[PDB]
Amino acid sequence: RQEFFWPEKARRTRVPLYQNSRPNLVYDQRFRRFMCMWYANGVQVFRPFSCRGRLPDGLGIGRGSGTWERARAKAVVLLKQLQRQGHLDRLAKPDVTRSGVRGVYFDTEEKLWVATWNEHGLRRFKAFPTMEMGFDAAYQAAVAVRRQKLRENYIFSMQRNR
Amino acid sequence: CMNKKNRLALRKRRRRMGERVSLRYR
Amino acid sequence: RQAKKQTKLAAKNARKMKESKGLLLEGKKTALCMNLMQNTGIAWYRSLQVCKHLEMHRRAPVPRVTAGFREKVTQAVAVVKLG
């Protein structure tokens, strides 16, 4: 379920997964499928919804309707089920990697906190130092940059178990 | 034009000139 | 390994036993055109050619078997098989 397959004959997209305001929600553009992200025990699991084509003649709501809006309608109804019942809502005690969150790595030549991220093909480096702020203040600021920049471009990053 | 890349190019090229060639296999 | 050639040879002989009929209407798929391709000497091309004289939709489900319907279908196959 945590495999990021890349078809050989397909159009490459800069942002395969689109992040939404709702925490437990994510849109996939590669397969035009709607998925929900939640932590379960320890790992990220999703519920892919079919969007392909194939009945009552009253109204085109529910049942066998092969419409692109069916997936969206099936996701909103499922979201309230988890919150109302309170089955699985709990924080991600599963860690990302050694260097805190994904995409952050320590410097080898000296004490620094690098946070690389792409934006319209460009990228940033340097970030904030570590010797001038210690191992606590500098670490806190390193994570704050990634979360703040991802809310503007609507970029979703898959969390790996290792 | 021995492989599937170069050989299929000829069929696709003729499709843009006002002809219809079956595509299907190869 | 070598016994597979002889074992699969029985499948070819089974086709002769299923012969002697105008056309094997029975099939696996719902579409009449797709089922008609199961016969020997017919493929995606000849399958559509036979249906041209039937004056029916491409994906038309096979209708009920009739004595008079078999004669028309069998006659069209011979014309198409000529090439």
């Binding site: - | 034009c1 003729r14 499709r15 843009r16 000139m17 006002g18 002809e19 | 000529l82 090439g83």
Partner: protein, 119 residues
């Protein structure tokens, strides 16, 4: 997406007619002239009468008839592998239009003399 004619909706295989409204590809041109052979022969006025059997409507749909039509039609769109870049095939309707107009073949829509044109 996969339309026929490309972005500019090219059409290098059809010929228009001055009279009426009807167009057909070069594939059907060969069959039309062969079928209407009685009118052409009588217009001018054995070795000369060699294609008489080919005038049959049912013979063209047989295995023998299918090969005769393909032999005359050489598929001008197909050429050598080195014909790349600026050396690309052009519309062959220029030659077909001349023969179709000189032979004085009637149009299926309306019986008329040479009225075909490139288009």
């Amino acid at each position: 997406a996969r339309r026929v004619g490309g972005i500019g909706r090219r059409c290098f295989l059809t010929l228009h007619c001055s009279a009426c409204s009807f167009f057909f590809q070069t594939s059907d041109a060969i069959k039309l002239i062969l079928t209407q052979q009685h009118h052409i022969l009588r217009k001018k006025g054995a070795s000369k009468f060699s294609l008489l059997p080919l005038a049959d409507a049912s013979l063209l749909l047989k295995r023998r008839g299918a090969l005769v039509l393909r032999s005359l039609h050489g598929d001008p769109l197909v050429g050598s592998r080195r014909q790349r870049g600026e050396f690309a095939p052009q519309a062959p309707t220029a030659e077909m239009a001349k023969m179709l107009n000189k032979s004085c073949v009637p149009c299926p829509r309306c019986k008329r003399e040479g009225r075909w044109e490139e288009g």
